[PDB]
Amino acid sequence: QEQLVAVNELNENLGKVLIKIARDSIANKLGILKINLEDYLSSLNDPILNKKGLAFVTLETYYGNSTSLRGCIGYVEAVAPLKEIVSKAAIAAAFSDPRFPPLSKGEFDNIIIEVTVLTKPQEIDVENRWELPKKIKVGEDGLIVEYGILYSGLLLPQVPMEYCWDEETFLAETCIKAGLEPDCWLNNKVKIKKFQGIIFREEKPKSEKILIIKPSEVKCKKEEI
């Protein structure tokens, strides 16, 4: 809205760009790609890239039929222009993860990059809380239930779907996560935000084709072999 990115704005080509931004940022810090990252980032003039959101980047070592976590970093404290938060996260995924050595030039070629974009959580202003279940959608919306610093509950978009919940159960379970009663969502004093997310990932290192993974395509665990 006020320069905030919406998930429906992120298509396969934008995911293609975010992935290349992450790729080049790392390549630039590894010393592989010769560029001025800052000027490079400001040259990407697609307005979408500059809308704000939250982002995470995880690097997985590529194998025939499996992958291995290689580094993960994400920022959820404050939204910032996509291209910037993604460039920053990519770099951190490669060099800041406390669990691995920094990425080496030798590894860069065998890593698959995954970029997750989350929208800025936003308050659901409905003065008829019983109509609250209608203003959200299981499989698309993440939730945040708050009531003063002491009570805060957060659920990612996928959770409700993989556990096969309906909209109300979803709000109840988040309330329980916040330390509140199952029906805390009907209480005007309890603030409720929603947000969305999306995932882009190379199916192979530097591949042209990328996989778009949506929280709404997750299978209810009860239907898993």
Swiss-Prot record:
Name of the protein in its database record: Protein STK_02290
Superkingdom of origin: Archaea
AMMECR1 domain: residues covered: 13-211
Species the sequence originates in: Sulfurisphaera tokodaii (strain DSM 16993 / JCM 10545 / NBRC 100140 / 7) (Sulfolobus tokodaii)
HAMAP family assigned to the protein according to its UniProt record, in alphabetical order: AMMECR1
